Amino acid sequence: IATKYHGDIEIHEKDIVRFEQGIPGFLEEKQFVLLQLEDTPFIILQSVNTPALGFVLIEPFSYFPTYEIDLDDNTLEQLQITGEQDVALYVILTVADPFDDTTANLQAPIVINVHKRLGKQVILTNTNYKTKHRLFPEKV
């Protein structure tokens, strides 16, 4: 598969995370692989079927210690999770112009279960989380 940031790689199918619903705005994008960008904290949610589609993810925790999240039992089972062991949690970055207005979408994290290879963008309901949370304090 050609990729957005990593050049041409190929992959085995147990790498592939399925997003049955795709994600809002890209509903038919139903296959992704997760690729670290060295030497960065960025995880690239890369389309197996669209080389030019790759989202920039970060583990929420490093930059928002407080970030805690409650999975509606709906979500809990379209992902089909059995407990904690599963699962992986990320936020989508909106890298802005300029860089210091970069924001993370805390209201809609990406949730994956690394064992069954199932993915979803979870719209957190009943919460004060925004769709744009700045990484950096705004100077001046």
Partner: protein, 72 residues
């Protein structure tokens, strides 16, 4: 499709989603939506916003991330 529903009058969508008018308040309506939970329901304004930000997030250049990593 446009329809008119009196107070406890419901609508059937596929096999099924069912919309149940549960109250008229009267600047607002208290709808009830029954669906299987492989299907999610959201306020439209919330869903659109998240669509918007997803799209906004799909344009990060490789240069941008290098600069962003540095500053991080």
């Amino acid at each position: 499709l446009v329809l008119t529903r009196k107070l406890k009058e419901a609508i059937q969508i596929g096999d099924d989603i069912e919309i149940t008018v549960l109250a008229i308040q009267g600047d607002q309506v208290k709808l009830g939506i029954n669906a299987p939970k492989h299907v999610e329901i959201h306020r439209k304004e919330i869903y659109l916003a998240i669509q918007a930000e997803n799209n906004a997030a799909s344009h990060a250049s490789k240069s941008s991330l290098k600069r962003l990593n540095e500053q991080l």
